[PDB]
Design a protein around this ligand. Structure first.
Ligand SMILES: NC(=O)c1ccc[n+]([C@@H]2O[C@H](COP(=O)([O-])OP(=O)(O)OC[C@H]3O[C@@H](n4cnc5c(N)ncnc54)[C@H](O)[C@@H]3O)[C@@H](O)[C@H]2O)c1
Ligand SMILES: NC(=O)c1ccc[n+]([C@@H]2O[C@H](COP(=O)([O-])OP(=O)(O)OC[C@H]3O[C@@H](n4cnc5c(N)ncnc54)[C@H](O)[C@@H]3O)[C@@H](O)[C@H]2O)c1
Ligand SMILES: NC(=O)c1ccc[n+]([C@@H]2O[C@H](COP(=O)([O-])OP(=O)(O)OC[C@H]3O[C@@H](n4cnc5c(N)ncnc54)[C@H](O)[C@@H]3O)[C@@H](O)[C@H]2O)c1
Ligand SMILES: NC(=O)c1ccc[n+]([C@@H]2O[C@H](COP(=O)([O-])OP(=O)(O)OC[C@H]3O[C@@H](n4cnc5c(N)ncnc54)[C@H](O)[C@@H]3O)[C@@H](O)[C@H]2O)c1
Ligand SMILES: Oc1cc(Oc2cccc(-c3cccc(O)c3F)n2)ccc1F
Ligand SMILES: Oc1cc(Oc2cccc(-c3cccc(O)c3F)n2)ccc1F
Ligand SMILES: Oc1cc(Oc2cccc(-c3cccc(O)c3F)n2)ccc1F
Ligand SMILES: Oc1cc(Oc2cccc(-c3cccc(O)c3F)n2)ccc1F
Ligand SMILES: OC[C@H]1O[C@@H](O)[C@H](O)[C@@H](O)[C@@H]1O
Ligand SMILES: OC[C@H]1O[C@@H](O)[C@H](O)[C@@H](O)[C@@H]1O
Ligand SMILES: OC[C@H]1O[C@@H](O)[C@H](O)[C@@H](O)[C@@H]1O
Ligand SMILES: OC[C@H]1O[C@@H](O)[C@H](O)[C@@H](O)[C@@H]1O
Ligand code: NA
Ligand code: NA
Ligand code: NA
Ligand code: NA
Lengths: 256, 256, 256, 256
């Protein structure tokens, strides 16, 4: 209730899924939270539910939406301590020959450039507060995934960008870190599975891809984010894996 | 004060340095802590200072000392939730030709096999409590260090062993993680620097090896350990870097 | 002279620097090489110098240039075995607040989407030949670099995309790998250094960033590419570091 | 036939499996090779088969055997250019509680300290020739394996030690690299599979653990070793993965 008291946090894509879990974790740590989302439904309800959270409609691909997000956060709360760049999307499975450069550009706009834009607009305020940036990347940026060339590329970019920005902002006392979740049970996961021939088999395989034998929860990503914001004062440029061990060991992926 | 309430933690090498910082962090989180050390001086004083911590003399290279450590922890506190394998040593700088197989074996006994032995003896109790293991490795296991072949090898072993054991213990609900610190200001760091021709220059270089421009503190490693024990329920087999960004970018290490 | 005899290779950005070194290495291995470049000067001279190499003017950011590159390679040589995606650029040092989303998009077009486009257009022919893709990424995609947020992000994307595509193309026998060079002495390196206040000091620091004490040569990247094409039949999705050890150890990047 | 002509190479464990593949690759590159093995059967036959290879009986865990190996190589051939530390063993699957500290020490003696000892004794000669060291580690040192805590730890140690030694030997022009194979079809693989309830199912799973859908060959590890010795002049401290993509993507390893 006090580990991040007095602090102001912006969470993009905070209306459902991982983002909502991060919002809840920060509120529970004593922070005031601005929920940014392009969809009103979840975020508005979350603002009614949580004292200490408010909702601002903002599409992170629209530069003027993001400018207004930052200026309204400062106008309403007087400071900015942490930006969590969580908004992102995973397209349906797509074989490489079924992808397009224009779909790839669109996905870069959301998963990479939206993170870049908010971070850039927020950094002057983060420098004043010795605040920090937390980017939500993905394990698959590090190890790859099948039928997801554009998505994987966007997350490799986010993880790398996190390290570059950590170097650039270190002289100013602003830490920049990322979290790479594995399979987290969210509405995106449920929507992707529903597209498959056997959604139940897809979900079962998703649970068993982790040594821990289940998928992760938004609250577990949220606790990692609160740690990075509030207690990881010597961590910058790290990639914190929240994956249940999926990257470990051999699996289902004589010498001729 | 309550994030790890009711839990029992063993910290090896807990009498000074990083270990003492981890002890303090766990006590502050509400746990009872057993301080294991081969040196009475720091650990006994820490037991007097901290309600909730007690000291047990134990050299982790001596199997019967470790057996007694575990059986006394259970006899006195009734459960075991977390083992922090922190005891270890860094020899003075040694060029490869100045090392010996027998010095290498001795360092393996402490930095690797002591961690192995306590973990093995503790695992039956950790399974009962769905507890966890935290090994203190080192950034240099991942990236190397000059004049430290044996030390580097021992830490590469610890980090790898953490992943193997995480796979083996996942079916039983026991997580196994490691922390890889960079330069942390401790009595070991101070003792190593005092051996150098210009200790002050060695310390200054140590501070500047991190983008953050300072060395880390035992309390920062301690906060990472408390996160891994108490809030990282979907993390297993991870290497949590607490290094101030030392692994990032180019440094001081035309084409002929 | 025979390790890649009978094979046809396309090298983008092959007119100078690393690309020209890769062209020479493949010609020396017995392959026929198509030099792609947006600049006529170096590539045309290279075509006159090397029997077995020909030059095709092609800007990899222009989809119809790339379509013609592939169709002319097939029309003239009857097969395609290897694509080396080397074309790319490093902007001058830019602090994060001096970058723009539109500059970032432009750099993505070259360093990431040009690689994507040629690969996509080439893959039907690579499947027929059980050929392979080699992407030239950068060490800084993995470890970060200062004053280079957009560049670093593009190379993290390339390395990640390499892994995704390796997964997707494995059933078809097409390997996809990348090379991550460190400091290689090329016209780009020389042009960037000339912008600095003391170019000589910048170059000296560049040599000393590697434990080997020099920068690398285009011929060394070329030999790595020939290995990946011709002899690495069980390697797919790898990142082959050609960096002189720059990522190893501590450098120039008490606890307060 | 000439890429490593005039050079002298020592391959430990060269009598069968990967080691024999490395021996053959170096002979085919024009080098003279000393086959070291503790077993006479395979190595003696290989010496009869290959002009340019000779067999020396040597157990790498016995320091005086290794001293004689080096002194006989110099006496007979006048120089030493490359050491390949391939000798090693994988115990049968062992749950953590079934391992022992004394078995762990024994495995460290072979997989880690034998590599250390030969390297140390060879380095004075490698400095004279600006030669290089190649250690055969394992992918599982990096990602873990189930039922193999001691083996995994030994290979994490080898990979880390490679980086440390690369730093130490860089001023002297001696490169130190490792190869991390995945599943390679060798007599060790066949012997381990024969211990399983269904050896055929174990082998089938082993083939399918790689995106490439087969296991690797000793000749493929051998080609990687020849590349590292003869053409990778700007590579030091690298871990070259020869794994068929096993580390990529998700596999067989809702949120409660
Ligand atoms: N779920 C997983 O398994 C998983 C794994 C790894 C990484 N991730 C990453 O975690 C993040 C959140 O994923 P999730 O599963 O919670 O997704 P989700 O679809 O359940 O929730 C995403 C939220 O972001 C919002 N959003 C989307 N586009 C936006 C835009 N342009 N501007 C503002 N808000 C926008 C959506 O409206 C939604 O509320 C994403 O970056 C995703 O890539 C998810
Ligand atoms: N200080 C750093 O910069 C740094 C960096 C990376 C990793 N580490 C690791 O962190 C750990 C702690 O290092 P530190 O700097 O705090 O060291 P330290 O020497 O200051 O403290 C180590 C403690 O361990 C105890 N210990 C040593 N051998 C023991 C044994 N056989 N049995 C029981 N206790 C024993 C010592 O008595 C001491 O109290 C070590 O594993 C070290 O390798 C330290
Ligand atoms: N030089 C280094 O230290 C270094 C380090 C790591 C990675 N790299 C990468 O290696 C690659 C080559 O770098 P370099 O140093 O040789 O650069 P360079 O500038 O010396 O040569 C690049 C070549 O690519 C061509 N090119 C540029 N844009 C193109 C386009 N749109 N279409 C076609 N050709 C185009 C240029 O005309 C030139 O001939 C780049 O991808 C770079 O990011 C270089
Ligand atoms: N086969 C795989 O899938 C695989 C995968 C990753 C790593 N590796 C590593 O590759 C190396 C070779 O493995 P392999 O599968 O070819 O094994 P193998 O058992 O088929 O051959 C090993 C050879 O080393 C010799 N050897 C063993 N102990 C020795 C000693 N004390 N002194 C000298 N020689 C000794 C054996 O007699 C034998 O000829 C090992 O280090 C192993 O850990 C193998
Ligand atoms: O970033 C990630 C996003 C994820 O979303 C989902 C959800 C359901 C299925 C899939 C999926 C699995 C295999 C291939 C593929 O293209 C997928 F989209 N990903 C899953 C894991 C991640 F690390
Ligand atoms: O595990 C580590 C242990 C460390 O201890 C120290 C302390 C002072 C100096 C050194 C040191 C620096 C360079 C070479 C060397 O051999 C050293 F011991 N390490 C420093 C960093 C780590 F990641
Ligand atoms: O991809 C790379 C590209 C490189 O180009 C150059 C050349 C000269 C200077 C720099 C440079 C150094 C520090 C910061 C920065 O922004 C630079 F551009 N990079 C150097 C290393 C790489 F890995
Ligand atoms: O170093 C390695 C050594 C290997 O040997 C073998 C051979 C057959 C089975 C196994 C194996 C598989 C799963 C668990 C386990 O304990 C094994 F030994 N490893 C396989 C892969 C490696 F990377
Ligand atoms: O839709 C899948 C899951 O999404 C998560 O974000 C919600 O917190 C869960 O209640 C829900 O089951
Ligand atoms: O000796 C160096 C440092 O060691 C740390 O463990 C102590 O907490 C500090 O008070 C001390 O300055
Ligand atoms: O311009 C720097 C260097 O670029 C390389 O590509 C050329 O091969 C060298 O001859 C030149 O010195
Ligand atoms: O025993 C399994 C395999 O081992 C390899 O080292 C040999 O080259 C193969 O001929 C054999 O099939
Ligand atoms: Na509210
Ligand atoms: Na006490
Ligand atoms: Na020509
Ligand atoms: Na012979």
């Amino acid at each position: 209730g006090t580990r991040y008291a007095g602090k102001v946090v912006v969470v993009t894509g905070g209306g459902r899924g991982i983002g909502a879990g991060i919002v809840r974790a920060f509120v529970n740590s004593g922070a005031r939270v601005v929920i940014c989302d392009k969809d009103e439904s979840g975020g508005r309800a979350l603002e009614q539910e949580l004292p200490g959270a408010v909702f601002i409609l903002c599409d992170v691909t629209q530069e003027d939406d993001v400018k207004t997000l930052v200026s309204e956060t400062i106008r309403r709360f007087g400071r900015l301590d942490c930006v969590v760049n969580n908004a992102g999307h995973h397209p349906p499975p797509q074989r490489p020959e079924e992808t397009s450069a224009q779909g790839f550009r669109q996905l870069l706009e959301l998963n990479l450039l939206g993170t870049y834009t908010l971070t850039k607009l927020a950094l002057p305020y983060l420098r004043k507060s010795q605040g920090n940036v937390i980017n939500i990347s993905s394990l698959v940026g590090a190890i790859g995934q099948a039928q997801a060339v554009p998505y994987v590329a966007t997350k490799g970019a986010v993880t790398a960008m996190t390290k570059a920005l950590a170097l650039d902002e270190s002289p100013y006392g602003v830490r920049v870190n990322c979290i790479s979740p594995g399979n987290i049970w969210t509405p995106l996961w449920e929507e992707l599975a529903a597209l498959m021939p056997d959604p139940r088999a897809t979900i079962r395989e998703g649970m068993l891809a982790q040594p821990l034998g289940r998928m992760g929860q938004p609250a577990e990503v949220g606790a990692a984010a609160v740690f990075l914001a509030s207690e990881a004062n010597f961590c910058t440029g790290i990639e914190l894996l929240v994956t249940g061990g999926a990257e470990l060991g051999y699996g289902c992926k004589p010498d001729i």
